[PDB]
Design an enzyme around this catalytic site. Sequence first.
Site, short mmCIF file in Angstrom:
data_model
loop_
_atom_site.label_atom_id
_atom_site.label_comp_id
_atom_site.label_asym_id
_atom_site.label_seq_id
_atom_site.Cartn_x
_atom_site.Cartn_y
_atom_site.Cartn_z
CG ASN A 310 3.59 -2.16 2.11
OD1 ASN A 310 4.20 -3.15 1.73
ND2 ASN A 310 4.06 -0.95 1.94
CB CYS A 312 5.15 0.34 -1.95
SG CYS A 312 4.52 1.99 -2.33
CD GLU A 314 7.42 -1.05 1.51
OE1 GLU A 314 6.74 -1.25 0.48
OE2 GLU A 314 7.34 0.00 2.18
#
Lengths: 608, 624
Positions: A310, A312, A314
Amino acid sequence: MKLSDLISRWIDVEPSKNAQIILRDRYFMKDLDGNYLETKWEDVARRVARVVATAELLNPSYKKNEKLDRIKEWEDIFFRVLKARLFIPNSPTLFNAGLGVKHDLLWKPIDQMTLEDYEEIYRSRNHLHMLSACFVVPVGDSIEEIFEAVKEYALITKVGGGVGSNFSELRPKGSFVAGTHGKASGPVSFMHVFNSAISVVKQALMGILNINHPDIEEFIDAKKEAVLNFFNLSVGFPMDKKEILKLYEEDGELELSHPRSTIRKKVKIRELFRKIATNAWKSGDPGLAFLGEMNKYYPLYPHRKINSTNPCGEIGLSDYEACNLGSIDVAKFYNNGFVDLEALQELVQIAVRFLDNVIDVNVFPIDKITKAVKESRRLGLGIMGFADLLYKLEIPYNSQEARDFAANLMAFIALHAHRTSYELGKEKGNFPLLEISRYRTEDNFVPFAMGMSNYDDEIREVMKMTKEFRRNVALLTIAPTGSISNIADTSSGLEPNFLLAYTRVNQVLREKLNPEILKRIEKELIEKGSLKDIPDVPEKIKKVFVVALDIDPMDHLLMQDAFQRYVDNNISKTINMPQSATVDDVLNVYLEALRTNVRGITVYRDGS
Amino acid sequence: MKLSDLISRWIDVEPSKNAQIILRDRYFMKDLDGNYLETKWEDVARRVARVVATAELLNPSYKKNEKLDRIKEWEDIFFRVLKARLFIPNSPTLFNAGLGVKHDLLWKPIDQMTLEDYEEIYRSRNHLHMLSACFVVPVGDSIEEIFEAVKEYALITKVGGGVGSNFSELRPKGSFVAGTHGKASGPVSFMHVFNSAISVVKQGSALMGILNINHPDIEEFIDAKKEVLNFFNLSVGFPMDKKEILKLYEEDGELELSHPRSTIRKKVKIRELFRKIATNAWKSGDPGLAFLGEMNKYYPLYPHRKINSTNPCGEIGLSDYEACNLGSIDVAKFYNNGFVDLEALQELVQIAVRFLDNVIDVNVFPIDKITKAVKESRRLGLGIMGFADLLYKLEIPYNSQEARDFAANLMAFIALHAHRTSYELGKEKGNFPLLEISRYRTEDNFVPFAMGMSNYDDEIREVMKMTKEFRRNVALLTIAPTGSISNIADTSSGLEPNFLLAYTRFVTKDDGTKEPLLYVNQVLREKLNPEILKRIEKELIEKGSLKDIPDVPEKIKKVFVVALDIDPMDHLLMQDAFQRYVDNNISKTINMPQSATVDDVLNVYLEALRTNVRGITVYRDGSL
Ligand SMILES: Nc1nc2c(ncn2[C@H]2C[C@H](O)[C@@H](COP(=O)(O)OP(=O)(O)OP(=O)(O)O)O2)c(=O)[nH]1
Ligand SMILES: Nc1nc2c(ncn2[C@H]2C[C@H](O)[C@@H](COP(=O)(O)OP(=O)(O)OP(=O)(O)O)O2)c(=O)[nH]1
Ligand SMILES: Nc1ncnc2c1ncn2[C@@H]1O[C@H](COP(=O)(O)OP(=O)(O)O)[C@@H](O)[C@H]1O
Ligand SMILES: Nc1ncnc2c1ncn2[C@@H]1O[C@H](COP(=O)(O)OP(=O)(O)O)[C@@H](O)[C@H]1O
Ligand SMILES: [Mg+2]
Ligand SMILES: [Mg+2]
């Protein structure tokens, strides 16, 4: 100490003026004229707990003649935890919970709720009722698929999601296209269309291209320095971190190829890495995404494959998978020099149920997303306030003590989250794909490396239990927590406080530091941005109240690895480097990175 | 003359070296390896004749007894008119005919062709067998429909199509979006995504955007390509009558800008609006005007179906999801002793209407709604090329009532036998599924164009009344830019006058690259003293015209006029003349001298409002 007594310590501490402004500004619902339907955090907490408690309507373990009692009990727990800010779900849950629903049902006192009221909530949920942060869609190697993906990006972005893609299916620039007009323009030229689309919809995405793609070099320079201002870019690594470390050490060569092409080339794996480091040294991008490491721990691999994360980092996700997140503020769990683990385990149980329940009341724009989530039921339970907790415990973030503390904390959390999933599996149903996953078809499969706690043994045995019952395919992640940590007045994810004072003063420093010593220095601290070279502040205060740039890049990387041994999804961590770091310091981060257990890497040099 | 003897005058005449560069560059089929499968225009004519003749399998008038013979006959007649270059279908027909088909079948001697071979051609045409140039797609007022439309643009563009849209359904900038209190960004904002998409699809080796004059963002639109939507042509759309708009202008009226899905409304002076357009057109050539009201007036299916946009070059008003395949007859080749050989011309119109209707049967579209729409209506675009070069032969100045009157008669003649062929074809093969609800049926005296400039009108009306019963196609005619196919046929483009009589296109002969090859109009070569050509030639290439050259006969200066020798109104009036006898629209640039003012542009617009033109493109000599 019991959670209920913990809740009572926090339930009435008012959100700061900082938190309250961010809330008014974008979390509090507003009627069709921009007037406030919600005016304080309590309204948000009530609305959110009630919407998510509604999912209990679907619990096969209950009956009529029990459901309403049981449902109201969940809203009541949910509500108290939320109002106390001991756990907060990802932003999309806060924004979009209750959209569609008659205002007089979302804030009506719990005692007054009937089984009919809960049912009407359930069914009045509209197409905007989307509560997950994280999406991944594929981008197949055809103009049709490219443009359907652009449409999906728009629809996901509209309703509030961050979306990521691996662009590697797209044949490189020059390849044959069975047609007339000639040649493929390549992954990167198409990412510009995604950028344009999003720049319009948004008037924050992830794009990965694998290391062995013939356009990798173009891709690595893609945000240099044409641009893709809406993308975070990461270099994908589908193969073993092992193979890549070794190839580098042996100064090997990597063959760039694509199946649907005759474009082939050889580059020295070290020149490529230097190319990456040089760009990252300048501007932050591209990151690295150890996709093969993700798949190593992927319970559904190889009959499903993680190709992207995604925006970012994570959650590594399979095609059309989304994941809803939520974070426990561990700084609120401090008690007498200890982390109140009694209360923590109770929250972890409540938090997993809440997150599983969000799935059932979530609405996605795309049927393939709805079906992917239903089959896997991936959760992203994490933590915020970790740094602040370490301040309270008088533990310097850059120390082996801190990392052994992290690993154990994360191990504990991992243990009870996975035990909670076994128990929900029992109560509600297993995740549809349990039969074909390595929790079943394998023995002693564990979806993280461990090796830094005494809970391993226990964890290794909860993992054997989940052979029979398991609600969710994975459950943990550490997210950035950019907004919600601000709501909770705490530190972000696992990160060190970036600063102690920023007029643009940390509450724990304010308590532990003698005032007037505090009053004296606070101007100098705002300028210098660290306590380090402020003279006449106690050595123990200096040592504990470390900021991000006081902590060297390996201490950052070793904190990430400590948490990552006990996290089944991935981790958002920035490896901060001092302004004076060299491109060779970045390569060194990358090499250490391939030896530790981390699933990805983001660096950022101060000044760049 | 019979067409057979005209084919004979032309069939063994090869394209010029100029055309051969074009063919090699983009028309000759290469194989998976990049090797040529065709090396001569004749190979192209073979492949394309064979494929469109394949559509004769479906002809329900043929006993299987006769089929192979009937198909081989149409193949040969198609082959003959194409090899001669008397008719040439739009470029995608030439690029894509036979894609998917096994290579042995496409060029093999005809006398080896079995009925199974034709069936095999038919079955194997792949997803890229797209033979039509012109498309319109809707863009509805939602994120999903906007982005389904971007996807359609990229897919049509990839296979060779030119696509347009009216963006007027999108709600203006800043308007209300349900359940967000976030605001709509507006049509122009999304047009940038369509542009980005296509700039990438077309990366290496065109579009129409229309916004209606009453849209509250029209002023923004008018300026969208000011110093950018570099891939769009832009027109301002008028769905109301040209009368209303002319009147409103004369009264110095105000216009209300409102949108169905917004509270934003505004009142603007029409004169001030028109002047904003004129200034921008005066500067860059965009935006044009699109008199959609006037297209709907002559649309057989309106109001059941509606025209909201045209394709890129404007010559086809198309309803939502509709496509149109075009082909053009070279009229220069029909010069026979100071007269236009009408006998030979009528046979070629009969043949060319059938060819173009056969394209529809072998045509593959990327989108189901397009196939359907196209199968429903069967719109053809038969046009002409080399008209300017024909005037040269007949010694007629383009800028004269004589040229305009001849043009209306020619077009009127063509239109007559084109619709009469659609008649015959409708009896022979079936009517277009929507004949029944069209104005050819639900009315007396429906004619799909203005007429009023030909002896032929009475007969046209006869034929239109006839097609209440039998009609293969909803409309049949257009004049297209013919940018490429007129270069293949070595002839002048569309109805347009020659831009230049003489120029250079340097050889790029590599292997010691150099050589300026000087072109002179072949008709100028034939009618001007080689002794004169000799001396003036270099002044002609510096000045771009004959007019102010000492010692060229006055009658050669008057006949061999170029585009800038012809004043704006004479451009406009010629367009009007053709459009009176064309059921689709007309591609025509109104060329203007550098010295033209914005008031001169305004007057062209007022004059177009009074003529029968269906839209306006202006270009000022030194703008761009
Ligand atoms: N820029 C650009 N790229 C194209 C164009 N056509 C195809 N491509 C690229 C897009 C994909 O990366 C790849 C394959 O495209 P498609 O599957 O749409 O091409 P098609 O199926 O006709 O040929 P294929 O069987 O896939 O070789 O080539 C085009 O016109 N422009
Ligand atoms: N730039 C931008 N424009 C938007 C956004 N959402 C909607 N619009 C514009 C696109 C169309 O011109 C118009 C309507 O969009 P949709 O039909 O997708 O919105 P929705 O159905 O949610 O609300 P509605 O019932 O149409 O008011 O608003 C957005 O998120 N960003
Ligand atoms: N501006 C944004 N637009 C879309 N998605 C976002 C945005 N910001 C964050 N996200 C999504 O949420 C994930 C983590 O969010 P953080 O942990 O940033 O969340 P929060 O906003 O709940 O404090 C990101 O990796 C991304 O998937
Ligand atoms: N570069 C292009 N890309 C896509 N479509 C085009 C392009 N050029 C022209 N067209 C389409 O072809 C139609 C006819 O143009 P011309 O008559 O310029 O085509 P050609 O001479 O190649 O047959 C135009 O009205 C437009 O719809
Ligand atoms: Mg393909
Ligand atoms: Mg809508």
